[PDB]
Amino acid sequence: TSQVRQNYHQDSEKAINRQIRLELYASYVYLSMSYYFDRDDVALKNFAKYFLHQSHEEREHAEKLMKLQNQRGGRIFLQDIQKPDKDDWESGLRAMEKALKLEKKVNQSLLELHKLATKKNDPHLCDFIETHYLNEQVKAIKELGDHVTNLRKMGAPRSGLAEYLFDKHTLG
Template sequence: MTTVSPSQVRQHYHQGSEAAISRQIDLELYASCVHLSVSHYLDHDDVALKNFAKYFLHQSREEREHAEKLMKLQNQRGGRIFLRDIKKPDRDDWENGLNAMECVLHLEKSVNPSLLELHKLATDKKDPYLCNFIETHYLNEQVKSTKELGGHVNQLAQDGGPRIWHGRVTL
């Protein structure tokens, strides 16, 4: 194993924070892969939920952007990015729009505690920059995203599935 020389810009950046950010990057990339898998499943010709597919493709890009922001932060702080293998989604068949929304809602609910743990670690290590970064770029957005998905799940459950108007599936 080779030794990596310390960064010249590293200052007041705890190794635990660096490791936690690497784990969060992995989680954000996994979430991006799940959203991408859902998008392409729902875009398949025998499922044909095009608007759902577009929604999940957009969400996949957002999750990837979250990972990229964390990577940029890691570099700015003088940390190193240590990616682990990103596991494949737990399933390949998402069945329908409602089931896909429920699965992704469950995933989003698992991301929030991870962000809160990262924020707590930054607070415990007296790292106001990291606290502010997580608050500004992640916590509120995560709550909004979870609320939005929960609303979609509730609407779909009440309606019995996706609504179709003029041959177009809508959320």
């Protein structure tokens, strides 16, 4: 038992390792999406930039959980990072729809993590998830929703103008 450990349940410690893994997976998904938009046959530079910014933010989410595990005296166990569901993300609209689903999946995991921290009477952990994660997810979800709404109303993925102009005026 770590000299620093206090009011930190073993279930919490394991759940934090699972969340770390999911943050690294989200990072990998956004990295894949980014370089899809960098292809000569896709060529939407601001989509590529938007998703690469998202990838680097997911790495920071992972690192802060690894910091928290060590702050509380838990022990980091890293696992294989699963390749994303797709190599070819098909269009700007479909990548955004996939990004929205991923952020709701990360959010559901953080809500399941807060539920566990609540059951284990770990208010430090509850505060950590609320301060650093829950509102980040609600903002990322609302923004991706906003982007999907716009791309659909502009007439994507059909009208080829829509994704070009959304790339320039919203993501650029």
